Structure formats: C-alpha cells, structure tokens
Amino acid sequence: AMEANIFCTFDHKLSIADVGKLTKLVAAVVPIPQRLHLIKHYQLGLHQFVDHTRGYVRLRGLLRNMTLTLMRRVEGNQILLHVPTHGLLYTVLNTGPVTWEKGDALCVLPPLFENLLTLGQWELVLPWIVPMPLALEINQRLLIMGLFSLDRSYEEVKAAVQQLQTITFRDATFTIPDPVIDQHLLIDMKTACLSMSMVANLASELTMTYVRKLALEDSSMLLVKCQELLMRLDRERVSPDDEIARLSALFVMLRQLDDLIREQVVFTVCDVSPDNKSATCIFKG
C-alpha cells in the first residue's frame, strides 16, 4: 500500500560512497521550494538561496514561505521525500546543536554553520531544528548585534558584541556568527534594523496628540495613565497629507518587521533515544 510521496532524481551521478554518505540522513528534514511531484536535486536544501549580499533574515523569510518535507529511504537512482500532514507523528534527525527533552517545542531556523556531500557547483545544506526559547534568544541577540554594527569602533561595543555573541543552553555553549562583515551590514539586516528603529522613532512623536484626544472619553481610565507616562517620557528628554503619509509609513514599517515577529511552531516532541540525534515528534502547522 503506497502513500503520497515526492520523487527526486539526482541529475549528477552519485557514487556508491556518496549514496552511503547520504543514507545516514534517513529521516532528516529537507525543505523544497514548490510542491511538485518529480523535483530535481538542485531544488533540495537551502544552497540555491544562499547569496553574498543577501542576509540571514531573507533566508528566514524564504524558509517561512518554503514547504517543509521529511525524508524516506534512499534507493536505486532515486530518493523519496514524504510531505507531512498536520497532526500525524513523524521521526526527525536532530541536526541542530542543541539536545532535546520530552515536551519541548521546536521551530525551524536557517543554518549558521562532518560536512555534507557536495558536487561540482552544488552543496547540500539543511536548516536547524531548535527549541523555541533558544530561537527567540538567538534572533534577539543577532538583531541587537545588528544595532551595534554602527558603533563598532569603540571598544565597549566590541566587548558587548563578544558577550552577546556567546549563547548558553542545556549542555550547549556554541557561538553564533557576527552579523557584520568588513564593518558593513548585509542589506536585509539593514532593512530590518532600520524598520525596527523607525517604528520605534515614529511612535514617540505621533502618539501624543491622538492619546490626549482620546483621554476625554476612556471609561477604562488606563489611557489617561498612558498619557501621563508619555508626558513623563517627554520630561525625561502639520498638513494632513504629511500626517496620513506618516501613519502609512508607520504601519508599512511595522509590517516589514512582521517577518521576524512571529514563530512557526513546527514540531512538539515525544521521548528521545540515547542516540539523541534521532527523535520523534508530531507535525504542527
């Protein structure tokens, strides 16, 4: 009795040793760009997406748009991928650098680092599977290091960047890559950081008028305390068309940051072997 499967044909020849190398990934996760039936090997993995100017957050967005798949037995001249369906359970290989415990929640992240088999113009790379708190921590730290990119010259910033760069978890102490190269920012990181800083900046000078107008009416009465908090912040430190453009800019800038704001809860885990590389989990949308 067959089931729904995706067929993949390696266009380049595969030696026996290469097939034996690949078979060790029996049940690893592999992303595919589109839900075809007979896909070519160039589409597998995240290699075709990597670029020299585009950054990590672009990979995160593309992976969110990506379709997640699971592997099946490799055999003569063909390899089979099984696309999961919600609320069934599956086996996954913990390619990530973090061990798992029962009841952990997992999400998929683009990679940051044996190596996997390569071809003449091709390499095979798979995304990370990480528990949600560490995913939040790593995204927060990488974004905040994007902020310090501008001030890097001073030694305080270098020490702070080094301290932020290290991450600690259950018996895991790896280091994440510095999001700056040659004292310059990759353009997607620049857009994300600028969007967050702008949506922070716009709210400081826009809210006061609308808040003070609404203060007359609130029966829930906390909006007046909000007004007082904004006035205390002020103590700490126009034509309608410009106003409407500014509101539109605020909301479009917020939507630009939505690429990083929400997390796909891909997997929840069932008990794991001492072979801990391998674990079982239930797929969630």
Partner: protein, 290 residues
C-alpha cells in the same frame, strides 16, 4: 494502471489481516502469542510516556488531569512534570480553604522542591511552563509511570469508557451565560503588578469563541483591573521591565452539553472540581496580550 483498479473501493484494514498474521500464515507457523488482533490498532490519539517522582502522583491516582512541564536551570533533572491541581497552590485565584487543603495533601518532599523552583527565579510563570495535555493511567512506586495524550479523544484501552478531564472549581471561569453546542476551553494566566511580588493568577476559561481577536478583546474587558495594575507598575517603577499582563494558550474542544460538576476524593480528603467527559485535546502554544 487499469480502470478496475482505479474504480475499486479503498483498502480495508477493517477485515484485512494484520502483518504478523500475514507472516505466520506465510510460513505456516504458530506461536503461543495471541497474535491475531492488535490492541491500540485503531487508536487515533497520539500517546506519550512520562516518569514522575512519587510525591507528585497524588490526585493523579484518579485518571484525568492536566500535566504541565516546568523548568529548572540546574544540571540535574532539568524538567519536572507537575499537575494543574498542585499549581493552584501558587495562584492568587484560589480560596483560602482550597489552598490550605492542597497544601496539606501535597506535603510530600518532591512537591515543595518544585514550588521552590517556581518562585526562586526572576522570570514569571509564563516563560517557565509548557502544557502536555491530559494524563490517563497510574503505576505507583518510588517512581511512577504516567501515559498522556497530546492530540486525542480521551479513552481507555478498549475504549470501553471515555475518560473525563477535571478542573478545580476555583480556577473555572465562564464569560457567557448561554453556551453554543460547541465551545473551546483555554488556559489563562494573569499577573498582578501592584503587589510587591509579581503575583500570578491561574484560570481555565470555556468560551464559544474560536477567533483570537475577539477572545482577547473580551479578556482585556474582564481583566481591566489587572491591565491597569500592569500600567501602574510600568509608570511607577522605571528601569523595571514588566510585560504581558496576561497570556493565553488554547487547550481543548468539547461539546457544551457535556459539562458537569463533580467532587473528587483522595486520601479520604474531598476536593471540588468541574468535569468534562467527552473532551478532546488540541494544543497551541502560549501567546501574549496587553
């Protein structure tokens, strides 16, 4: 491919042989094992197995309860599996009599360690906890075995009887007077920021609302005092970073006519609970509202 094969009715696990039967038929061999009918073959519910220390098992000796995973940063066992009933001892949304009863019943050594770990860290309960659905068997000992469902209809092995889920009465909350035949049940945590401690409240909420925006609207409507407390602490005490006056998690769908009120007995002590028989578990993650 042929037309008859395409038109033929789908395969029938209902009467076709199980795999072991096929093999033993093939070799014509018989073991002493009653190999024909496999238990749990038709089970749709996804089951997990958990080990727990002996102290916490009380009130789980009666089948049906929420099983929660709590975190502890120590090198030695990083997670401890706790029950919703014990978690009430920390909430400020429990009457003095019920809290005293729970404090008396759970006085085993292991339980108090979990209570210490719950409030010995700076972080609130929201970041510390995660839900594992409903627990449905006991096997007692110095370490006890629990089995638990994470996407399920809640039943005994032969499905001879449905297993209910029990919620303590003080935590149970309703936001509508009339109930549609379908309504969802959620886990609710709210925080009081006016007191010196970040004092948490624990709630379980049944509502006919499935869409997040309107549910959060009603929640902010009812929890207005707690929201005002959050704003008050934010304005009053700078350099402090509070967050999320309340958090929501989705956990269940049930047919509203099923709800009953019942009493629960253990150690010849009597507890008051609300009961949902024909229950099912659907699990989402925590989410924040302000």
């Amino acid at each position: 491919m042929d037309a008859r094969a395409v038109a033929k009715r789908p395969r029938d696990p209902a009467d076709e042989d199980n795999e072991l039967v096929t093999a033993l038929k093939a070799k014509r061999e018989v073991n002493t094992i009653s190999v024909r009918y496999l238990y749990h073959a038709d089970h749709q519910a996804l089951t997990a197995r958990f080990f727990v220390p002996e102290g916490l098992v009380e009130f789980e000796a009666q089948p049906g309860a929420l099983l929660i995973r709590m975190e502890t940063g120590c090198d030695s066992p990083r997670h401890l599996y706790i029950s919703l009933y014990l978690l009430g001892i920390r909430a400020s949304n429990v009457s003095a009599s019920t809290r005293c009863l729970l404090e008396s019943v759970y006085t085993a050594s292991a339980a108090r360690a979990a209570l210490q770990w719950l409030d010995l860290g700076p972080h609130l309960l929201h970041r510390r906890l995660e839900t594992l659905g409903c627990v449905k068997t006991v096997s007692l000992g110095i370490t006890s075995l629990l089995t638990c469902v994470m996407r399920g209809y809640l039943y005994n092995t032969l499905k001879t009887e449905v297993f209910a889920l029990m919620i303590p009465k003080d935590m149970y909350l309703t936001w509508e007077e009339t109930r549609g035949r379908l309504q969802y049940v959620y886990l609710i945590i709210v925080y009081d920021y006016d007191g010196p401690e970040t004092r948490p409240g624990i709630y379980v909420l049944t509502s006919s609302i499935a869409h997040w925006q309107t549910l959060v609207d009603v929640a902010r409507g009812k929890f207005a005092r707690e929201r005002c407390s959050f704003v008050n602490r934010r304005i009053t005490r700078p350099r402090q970073i509070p967050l999320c006056t309340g958090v929501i998690q989705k956990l269940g769908w049930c047919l509203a006519d099923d709800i009953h009120t019942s009493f629960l007995v253990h150690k010849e002590l009597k507890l008051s609970v609300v009961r949902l028989d024909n229950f099912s578990v659907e699990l989402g993650d925590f989410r924040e509202f302000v």
